[PDB]
């Protein structure tokens, strides 16, 4: 087992990575910016290290810093979290060749699912649903763009090869040019690749992933799935297990595929495939290699720990579990609750001056936050996950109705209250809302 880590993120993942350590005897090192002195996390860790000032260039995207410090420290592996350079390819394999562990796949399927053309063409030939389109990327030969949209039939969107997210619905040939044209620099201007794609266009599609865990011995095992279908402007607002309405066949129709797809293309470590699901129908979007922020809900409904998993895998121990020993059980939503202005929906930084968090049966509460904590503007609105368990849907639902009306964190803006309306949406009531309904509920 792995003697010490490297938390190479900050605020709830971070915690949440620190207790895992602690629950298993790995050692901890807290890397932070100077901004970050007081995060929850950093005050309970066993080393910490300042990798540098506020903003995330000179700090948690630093590699070089981060790296020091595992050298520092004597550490071993480095666990990424989500978000900063948990994707990154290139910090993957500089880790790898510095000679600490990745807490993650390898880096080379890192880059192959980071880029959606070859990700879409290996899920394809692992006999994942993709969505019908280009399958290759499109050139500059207008002709043969109008013959791919034709044959995909329209509507369809046009996709930028890496990852906000810049694409382009097209209804019709006159929007064609144009509309690729557009993708394509923004593209070029983002990620400096100016590559793009075309996917038929779903118009009422549910957003369902589905959790994975494989580790070094060749076993891959899928874990049920989740529905974050309630986002907006493409983020997250509120995930639940099991999806509402997937029955128990679909669950292992498409779970069996996910698994295949992990040991065709060696993949190790936590991951989540996503799909676009309409009509009973499942299609590939992208794999997200890395844990997520939604993973406390699949830990309710299984059982498994999925963070003490990766440090497992990463240090060469099997699967805790067979798939025959993953059993659905229960429901779990989790909220997300931001530092974020009601009527802007821009970041509220300041300064938390009283703080309750719920509690009770079935009451998780994911966050660094306490009393007298100041939210700094330099990173994301997410202060903190209200995950709530329950033996069905509707219990779930009553028990997260109950605990947000306890939640008390006064001396900046949250979107508690709207968190609130949406349990109380009659339509979130009886399930399966698709992925545009909350910013036509609000008129966004
Ligand atoms: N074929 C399609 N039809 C309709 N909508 C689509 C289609 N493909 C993508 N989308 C939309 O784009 C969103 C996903 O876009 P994209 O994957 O580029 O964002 P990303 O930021 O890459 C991410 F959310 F996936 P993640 O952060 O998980 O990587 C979906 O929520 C969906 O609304
Ligand atoms: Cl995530």
Redesign the pocket.
Known sequence: MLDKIVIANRGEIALRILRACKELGIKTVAVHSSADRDLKHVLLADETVCIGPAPSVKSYLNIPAIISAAEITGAVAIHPGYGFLSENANFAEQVERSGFIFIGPKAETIRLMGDKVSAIAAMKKAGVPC?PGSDGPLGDDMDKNRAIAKRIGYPV?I??SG?????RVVRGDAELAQSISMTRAEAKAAFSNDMVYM?????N?R?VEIQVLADGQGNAIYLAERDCSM?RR?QKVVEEAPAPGITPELRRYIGERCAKACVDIGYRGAGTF?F?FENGEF?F??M?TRIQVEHPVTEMITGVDLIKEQLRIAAGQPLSIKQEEVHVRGHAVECRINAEDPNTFLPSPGKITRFHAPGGFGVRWESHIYAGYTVPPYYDSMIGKLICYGENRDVAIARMKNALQELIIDGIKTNVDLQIRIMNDENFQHGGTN?HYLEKKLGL
């Open positions: 969505v969107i996709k930028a990852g906000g997210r810049g694409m996917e038929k266009y779903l118009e599609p957003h986002q493409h996503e676009l299609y979007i992208e997200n992925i």
